[PDB]
Structures are given as structure tokens and as C-alpha cells.
From a paper:
DNA polymerase theta (Polθ) has been identified as a crucial alternative non-homologous end-joining factor in mammalian cells. Polθ is distinct among human DNA polymerases, exhibiting not only a C-terminal DNA polymerase domain (Seki et al., 2003, Shima et al., 2003, Yousefzadeh and Wood, 2013) but also an N-terminal domain exhibiting similarity and motifs typical of superfamily 2 (SF2) helicases (Singleton et al., 2007), separated by a long and lesser-conserved central domain of unknown function (Seki et al., 2003, Shima et al., 2003, Yousefzadeh and Wood, 2013) (Singleton et al., 2007). The Polθ helicase domain (Polθ-HLD) is a member of the SF2 helicases, most closely related to the Ski2/Hel308 family of helicases, which are involved in the ATP-dependent 3′-5′ unwinding of lagging strands on replication forks (Tafel et al., 2011, Buttner et al., 2007, Guy and Bolt, 2005), thought to facilitate replication restart at stalled or damaged forks. Like its archaeal homologs, Polθ-HLD comprises five subdomains including the two core helicase domains and three additional, closely associated globular domains.
We determined the structure of Polθ-HLD (residues 67–894), in a complex with the non-hydrolysable ATP analogue AMP-PNP to 2.9-Å resolution, and with ADP to 3.2-Å resolution, both in the same crystal form with a single copy of Polθ-HLD in the asymmetric unit. In the nucleotide-bound complexes, AMP-PNP and ADP bind in the nucleotide-binding site in a similar conformation to that observed in other helicase complexes. The α, β, and γ phosphates are in the equivalent positions as found in other helicase nucleotide complexes with conserved polar contacts formed to resides in the helicase motif I. The electron density for the AMP-PNP molecule is significantly weaker than in the ADP complex, especially around the adenine and ribose moieties, suggesting only partial occupancy in these crystals. Analysis of the nucleotide-bound crystals reveals that the same arrangement can be formed from the crystallographic symmetry operators, suggesting the tetramer is unlikely to be a result of crystal packing interactions. Comparing these profiles directly with theoretical scattering profiles calculated from the Polθ-HLD tetramer crystal structure reveals good agreement between the experimental profiles and the Polθ-HLD tetramer in crystals (χ2 = 1.60, χ2 free = 1.80).
Numbering used by the authors:
A (entry chain A): 184 to 245, 256 to 368, 375 to 521, 524 to 563, 580 to 599, 605 to 844, 851 to 891
B (entry chain A): 540 to 563, 580 to 599, 605 to 776
C (entry chain A): 658 to 776
The structure:
């Protein structure tokens, strides 16, 4: 390779890969995007450990060494970061398109200093709530532009996309179709068809709105649906996009006008960073003269809105802080350097303490070392006082697991190996079912209903885990979460068993729509869960391999691939092809093509026909049109639009390329 | 199951080819037995017999139909509660007990029982090994075993054998194993070649039934 | 030790599904496999020629204990008849048999020193 692109979690592991192999000399530079996540995040702390580890290593050799290029938004303590990394600093306020941040109260629009800049009057009045939200969107569209409309909840976005699209139908004509006849009639049709041929299908609300250049966008949608909408909006096919805060931190997506519906997001006042990420998407370089931002408020929330327009970002925290003498991030940082073998003695530990971002701002370290000693993570030998890794230590590092989590996992696995159920895959799935964060709001009454209907083989697994029927009843009768007490990890257990059931149907190739109706969770939450469990399953497998647990490793090593695509064991071979997901793999399997080998000798036009059969239609489906011989109705990654013929031809070509590399 | 005798006429055609008929009913009784124990199917083209999954599995495993019944239940029993921390429980499933490979000294057995680690005592209980029966073996040499439910004897004999197979695949010297258990090197070597074959059978049997986790 | 009624197995399997968890634990702890109950409804194969097929008596015994449970739970004779499918004659003959047997097992436990069990 030359350039490896990683996320934060994956990059930190790769660095650790380089420490065990001493191939640190391969790495020439690291580029960090969004440097403000150094401060506070679910994973933002990994960015510091990553950088600090580099700063500690480059110090042990103290012509060029390791270069660091970091970039972010305007931070108050930005000079502190450049000094910590011994980096030269640069800061600018330049912006090719001037941003006009404003706030609307009633009909009046004010700037940051509460001076009136426009008295707004709606060109055609419509009914509803109407803080001139539709009229504002209409004004932008008429000037042949596009508008981003940010809403608090997922439900408002769909409701608003519906109102706007509905009014767009009445007003243009002055009184679920085909797109109007312009130069783009073909591409609006291509978008809906691409949505149709997806594991999710074509959303009911989108079928109404998309024909009129209107759409919504939130985390409830699948990642493939969101890739389509973002592309459509970026091309101009969609003129109005009602989104959530998910997009504001997502990919680069600019617009002429940005509208924020309210300064109250999720029942709480809006964060400043979120605000700057929304209004930052106003103004297209090379297209617009200005970018306008409008924050709609009332007189009551009037004062709070101005606070955002004048507000500024908070200083970057270290995420390694001391009430408590010990902290998770510190324990982990120390584990990586001792087990990795770059900090052995006691003097090296405090040398590392100098390289931290925490010390750049101007004991606890010794407390973390003892913690690693108490929990058998690290060893001390009598050449006075030198610290070494244990098997539990070396296992934890290679698994990329958190030392705090490793303790409960290690005990739980030993518990499973004393009495294990093998007749189904449920018990194995439970061991690789992640529960460090909530992926959905579980309806407990529904849960209890599935409990009664649950077969005996899976009830045995429930009991073997910790699931008491009494607790499930005490969840439905009273919404008492309790969980203040630490031993009330009892809550996580029932949440974990609920999740494993979902993962069971998922690898049982149950349709996303059935699973949504059965459990009551959207397709967005499911897909986010499987990508989490696929990663976690790999960790527990590595953890079992480094501990010598062969029997346990043997059972786990098949669920990482199955959780990823959501398939059964038979389709594991087909899904090696890039274009083949769960659905396409099944219909090709049911038609005689079981392996890549069977797929390389395959006739292209036959594959094309089989693909046409896996598609979901609203009428019980599955004109001689010689105009659809060229319709690009198949989506890819880094994509050119693919026709059903080209996709079929690519699959057979790819199958052939893989088969040859196997010999 | 092999598919060379399908109908009822073919069965008696086979009866003519036997060595038993060369010397010059019962066949029909065996067919019903295969029906009662779900080994074979009967469809309504009157009266044609077909193999089940249990049938096709038994044939491919080269197992005796009489033995297959107890094996099929025992495996289902193991999959309801299985110990994975050691290889003992797995070895028990592939430990053959259709013939005696040695004369077991029960007093020695009880001595190894007390010294046995907790992880392997859990496997003993999970199988059927009661400490009371081991004591009743040392005190009095009462084999009993006239009653059919006294397959209880085979269980303790089987668990004794699995211990031997455990040390064997743990690369313990043949001389240590001889002194520890009290069996000659001839009996041990004859046992491992028997268990190697049986282990392959149970693996095939598990594969044809779709029991992937167990096969693995 | 004797059959007190002709048990309808399909009805039995229906009561099995509706059975609370506390009583399913007792069923498993005894020998009751759900697979065997299904193989009773699908095919009326009694087998029981083999001695180890005392497995039949176990499911028959657990069926009977359910009846005795409702009986000492003061459930009307008419409900029990409709629920299980046995006449009032067979039930009453059963309880007088179980009352005697219960006394035997109690004495048996007392003479062996099993105080906790006797209690
Ligand atoms: K793929
Ligand atoms: Mg950026």
C-alpha cells in the first residue's frame, strides 16, 4: 500500500500491529481530520492515545521521523495542541462564500447583533403550523437552488418532507407520479428504481416526496438509502432535504440556504458545535454569491437562539482526567505501552507522562500500574522493578478490548465453558452480542410476548444466561429501570438476550421488514447493530485464540462473516464477490450457483435474469420497453450507475478473477 | 437406504439371494422395525419404502442400527449441556464401548477418582458416573448387568476408557499409562485404533444430521 | 404401576405449551423430553418392548402428577375431566392409590434417615 485510510478504532489497532512487529519504520506520516474530537467523544480519546503513543516512540529515538498533520474548526486552545505535538501553527478565517447567519422571529429576520436585516412576507399562504417554513423553502427553489432543513426528531423530518412535497404539487400547477419532463426525467427515475432494488425497498414516504425533488434523511434509514439521497441532492435531483443532526456531522453536503427549525433538539437546547456544523453547509463554492442560515425561534426561545449565533466552541479536554484517581482511558494507555514492549521499567512510565496532552497544559500513573498488577494484567519481577505482560495482558491487547470490559468477558467465557448449549447458535451469538451502548428503545411488553412463544431450546439458553421471567414482568408492569446499583448489570443481561434474538433472525436471513415489525426497531438501528456485533465477534475470537481456548475459538470463528452480511453458512463463499450481498447470494444459490467456481463458468445473461427475480415490488409482481436496456438501476460503492446487465457481467468477471488467485 | 431395494417385492427377491435361503416372513418384521424407529419411510403406486435422514446418516456412518438409537439420543443429550473447557467430554462421545478392551481394577479407579480435578468431575456427573456405584464395585465384585437398564456398567467402563484416551492424546508415555491404570501396552494400542475409527463414524453421523457445531 | 386412564397425547402436548416455567423445570428434571411428546401425537407408537423404554412410564407419570396437582388445588372434578379427558371414576380411583403410595414413600424415607425428604 502507500496510503491506508482508517477510522479511529481501526487506526489505533493498526498502530498496535506495528509495535508488535517493530515495523514502525514503515510509517511516514499521520493525517488527522476533525482534530476537535481530541476533546470529548465515545472514541475521541483514542485519538490522544494514538498521538501520545507516537509522541512517546519518537522521543525514544531522540532526521525527519514521523510527521503529524492535524486540522479542525477554530479552537480556543489550538495553540496548546500545536505545542504538544511540537507543531507549527496556522489559523485563518478565510471562506470563499460569505455566510449570513441569521435568526427569524415571526416575520422579522435579525443578525447576530439583533439588528433587522429583512422583513419576511410569504408569497402564497398555506395552512398548518407554518412559521413560514414552506414559504422559505419555496423562495429558494424558485431561484433554482436547494435548501437543507434541519429538524429535531426523525418523525418531524418525514412529516415536514410530506407537507412541503404536498404543497409543491398544488402551487406549481396553481390548483407518486413520474418526474416532470426536463433534462433529468431519466435520473429521478433511476434513483427510485435504485431504491427499489435494495434490501430495504422503497420507503413509502419517499415514494410520495422524491418525485418532487423532496426527501428526508436520518439514522432510521439504512446506510445505502442515505448514500442515494446524498448523491441525488449533490447532483441537484433533490432540491429539498429535511435532515437531522446525523447529517450535520456526516459527509460534505452544501446548500444555498440552511434552515434550522428550532433551537430545541431532543427536548434540550441545541449544542454549539452542532449549530456550527449545520450553518457551515451554507454556501456552495463557485455557485452561490452568499450562504444564508436561518434559525427559527419564538420570543421565549429568542434569547437562546442569539446565544448560538454569538457563541463559540469549548476548550479541548484531555479525556484522561482525575474525584477518581483512576480512569479508563489511562489504564488502557498504560496497558498498550507495557504489553507492547515500549515501556518496561518504572522510569519509562513517567517519561510517557511527559508526552501526554494532559501534561502539555501545565502519580496517577502509578495507580494504574498497580491496577494492572491487581488484576493479573501485568507482572513485576525482582535489576529493580521491571514490569511485564501476562497472557491475559497479551490477549487483551491483541483483541483491542478495553481492560475494564475484559474482566467481565473473561469470567463470562469461563462460565460458558462449564455448561454450554450447542443445539442452536443462540448461545454462541450471546457471547458475541455487544452491550456497551443502547442501539434501540426496547418495547418490553412485545419482548414478554416473544418470550412465551419462544421454543424450549432457546429458553434453556435464556435461563443459562441470567434471564428471569419475573424481571421481564416487572419491566412491563412498571417502567422501573433502577440500574443505579452496580449489581444491576441484570438490566444489561435482558437487553443483551433481546439483542441476540435479533442477531439470530438476522443470520437466519429473515427480511429486514419482518424483523422491524416483530421487534419494533427500525432498519437503521438493526444495520448499525450488526456492524457492531461483527467487529465484537472478531475480538472475542482473537481473545479466545490468545488464551488457548481452541474449542471456544472453533465455534466463534464462523459468526463474524455471518453477522456482517446477515447470512447462513452456505452463502459465505458467494459473498466474497463484492457486488453480492445476502439477497443476491440467496437467489443465485437457489438457482444452481453455490460457489464462486460455479459462478465463474456461469453465463452472464443467465445471472442477469436471476437478479431480476430477487427484487421487491409493491404489487404482487415478483409494455415492451426498449428504453430500459440502458437504465442504471443498480447501486455500487464509489459508483458508476450499473445496469442489471453490467452488474451481472461484473459479477462473473470478478468471480473468475478470484478463482485464479486461489491456485 | 442405498436405493437397490425400494418396493416390497424387491425385499423377498433379496431373501432368495441369502446364504440362509441356500440351505433349503422374518424380513417383513425387520422392515417394520425400521419403520417404528424412523429409519425408513412408507408412501401411498402401492407400498414403496424410502430412507429418512436418520437412515441416510446411519448408512454413511457405517454404524449398526441397534447402536445408532442410543448414540442419537446421547448426542442430543450432550448438546443440551456441554463442557468445553477440556477435551474430556468430547472424547467421551468418541469413546467406544461395544467390547471389553481390558480388565479394569476398580480400586485403582476409585483412587484416580478422588485425585481427579473438578473440571473432569463435572464431566463425570454430566455423563452418569455416580460415586456410590464406584464404591459398590470395590467392596463387592458384583457385575450384575443381567438387567438391561444396567447399561450403567458400560457408562463407568466408558468413562474409565476416556481417561486413558485423554492421557494418550496428551502424549503421556505408554509406560506411565500402564502403571497408572494397570493395562498392558497391547490393550492400549488396540483401543486407540478402535477409537480412531469410531471417532470418524460419529463425525460423519453428525455431518449428515446437520449438527455443524458438534461436527466442528 | 398400573394404567388409570387412556391418555390423549395431543391434549397433553397442548397443556405442555401452556405450562408455566416453574413446572417445565420440573418436567426436564424428571425425564420429560418434548421430542417424545411430539412422537406420541404424530404416531401412536407405544414401543415399550425394550426395558429401557421406562421412558414411557415417565411421561405417563408426569401427566398423572399434573392431575394430582389440580386435585389438591381444589379444582372441581368437572374441570379436571374436561381439561384432561378422564372420567371422575378414574380420578377418584387414582387419588386413593396415590394417597396410599405417598404414605409408603414417607415411611421409606423415615426408615432410611432421610429427614429432609420425609419432612
Ligand atoms: K459483498
Ligand atoms: Mg473537514
Amino acid at each position: 500500500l502507500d496510503i491506508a485510510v482508517c477510522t479511529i478504532e481501526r487506526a489505533n489497532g493498526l498502530i498496535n500491529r506495528l509495535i508488535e512487529e517493530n515495523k514502525m519504520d514503515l510509517l511516514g506520516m499521520v493525517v488527522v481530520d476533525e482534530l476537535h474530537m481530541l476533546g470529548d467523544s465515545h472514541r475521541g480519546y483514542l485519538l490522544e492515545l494514538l498521538l501520545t503513543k507516537i509522541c512517546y516512540i519518537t522521543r525514544k529515538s531522540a532526521s525527519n521521523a514521523v510527521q503529524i498533520v492535524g486540522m479542525s474548526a477554530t479552537l480556543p486552545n489550538l495553540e496548546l495542541v500545536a505545542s504538544w505535538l511540537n507543531a507549527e501553527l496556522y489559523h485563518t478565517d478565510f471562506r470563499p462564500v460569505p455566510l449570513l447567519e441569521s435568526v427569524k422571529v415571526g416575520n422579522s429576520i435579525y443578525d447576530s447583533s439583533m439588528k433587522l436585516v429583512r422583513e419576511f412576507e410569504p408569497m402564497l399562504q398555506v395552512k398548518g403550523d407554518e412559521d413560514h417554513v414552506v414559504s422559505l423553502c419555496y423562495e429558494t427553489i424558485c431561484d433554482n437552488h436547494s435548501v437543507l432543513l434541519f429538524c429535531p426528531s426523525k418523525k418531524w423530518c418525514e412529516k415536514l418532507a410530506d407537507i412541503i412535497a404536498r404543497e409543491f404539487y398544488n402551487l406549481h400547477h396553481q390548483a407518486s407520479e413520474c418526474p416532470p419532463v426536463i433534462l433529468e426525467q431519466k435520473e429521478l427515475l433511476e434513483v427510485m428504481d435504485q431504491l427499489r432494488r435494495l434490501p430495504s425497498g422503497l420507503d413509502s414516504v419517499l415514494q410520495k416526496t422524491v418525485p418532487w425533488g423532496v426527501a428526508f434523511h436520518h439514522a432510521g434509514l439504512t446506510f445505502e438509502e442515505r448514500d442515494i439521497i446524498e448523491g441525488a441532492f449533490r447532483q441537484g435531483l433533490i432540491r429539498v432535504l429535511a435532515a437531522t443532526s446525523t447529517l450535520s456531522s456526516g459527509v460534505n453536503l452544501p446548500a444555498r440556504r440552511v434552515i434550522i427549525r428550532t433551537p430545541i433538539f431532543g427536548g434540550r437546547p441545541l449544542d454549539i458545535l452542532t449549530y456550527k456544523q449545520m450553518v457551515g453547509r451554507a454556501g456552495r463554492k463557485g455557485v452561490d454569491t452568499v450562504g444564508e442560515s436561518i434559525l427559527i425561534c419564538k420570543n421565549s426561545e429568542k434569547s437562546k437562539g442569539i446565544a448560538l449565533l454569538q457563541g463559540s466552541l469549548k476548550p479541548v479536554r484531555s479525556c484522561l482526567q482525575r474525584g477518581e484517581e483512576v480512569t479508563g482511558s489511562m489504564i488502557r494507555a498504560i496497558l498498550e505501552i507495557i504489553v507492547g514492549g515500549v515501556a518496561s521499567t518504572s522510569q519509562d512510565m513517567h517519561t510517557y507522562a511527559a508526552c501526554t496532552f494532559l501534561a502539555a497544559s501545565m502519580g496517577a500513573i502509578e495507580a494504574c500500574v498497580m491496577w494492572l498488577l491487581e488484576n493479573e494484567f501485568i507482572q513485576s519481577t525482582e535489576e529493580g522493578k521491571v514490569y511485564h505482560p501476562t497472557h491475559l495482558g497479551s490477549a487483551t491487547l491483541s483483541s483491542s478490548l478495553s481492560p475494564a470490559d475484559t474482566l467481565d468477558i473473561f469470567a463470562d467465557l469461563q462460565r460458558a465453558m462449564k455448561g454450554f448449549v450447542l443445539e442452536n447458535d443462540l448461545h454462541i451469538l450471546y457471547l458475541v452480542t455487544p452491550m456497551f451502548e443502547d442501539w434501540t428503545t426496547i418495547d418490553w411488553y412485545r419482548f414478554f410476548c416473544l418470550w412465551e412463544k419462544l421454543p424450549t431450546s432457546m429458553k434453556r439458553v435464556a435461563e443459562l444466561v441470567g434471564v428471569e421471567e419475573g424481571f421481564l414482568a416487572r419491566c412491563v408492569k412498571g417502567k422501573v429501570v433502577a440500574r443505579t446499583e452496580r449489581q444491576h448489570r441484570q438490566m444489561a443481561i435482558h437487553k443483551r438476550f433481546f439483542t441476540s434474538l435479533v442477531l439470530l433472525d438476522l443470520i437466519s436471513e429473515v427480511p429486514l421488514r419482518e424483523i422491524n415489525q416483530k421487534y419494533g426497531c427500525n432498519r437503521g438501528q438493526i444495520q448499525s447493530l450488526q456492524q457492531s456485533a461483527a467487529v465484537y465477534a472478531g475480538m472475542i475470537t482473537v481473545f479466545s485464540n490468545r488464551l488457548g481456548w481452541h474449542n471456544m475459538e472453533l465455534l466463534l470463528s464462523q459468526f463474524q462473516k455471518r453477522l456482517t452480511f446477515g447470512i447462513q453458512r452456505e452463502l459465505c463463499d458467494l459473498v466474497r464477490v463484492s457486488l453480492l450481498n445476502a439477497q443476491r447470494a440467496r437467489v443465485l444459490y437457489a438457482s444452481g450457483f453455490h460457489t464462486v467456481a460455479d459462478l465463474a463458468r456461469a453465463n452472464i445473461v443467465e445471472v442477469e435474469v436471476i437478479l431480476k427475480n430477487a427484487v421487491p415490488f409493491k404489487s404482487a409482481r415478483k409494455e415492451a420497453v426498449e428504453e430500459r436496456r440502458n437504465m442504471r438501476t443498480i447501486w455500487v460503492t464509489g459508483r458508476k450507475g450499473l445496469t442489471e446487465r453490467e452488474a451481472a457481467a461484473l459479477i462473473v468477471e470478478e468471480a473468475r478473477m478470484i478463482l485464479q488467485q486461489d491456485l
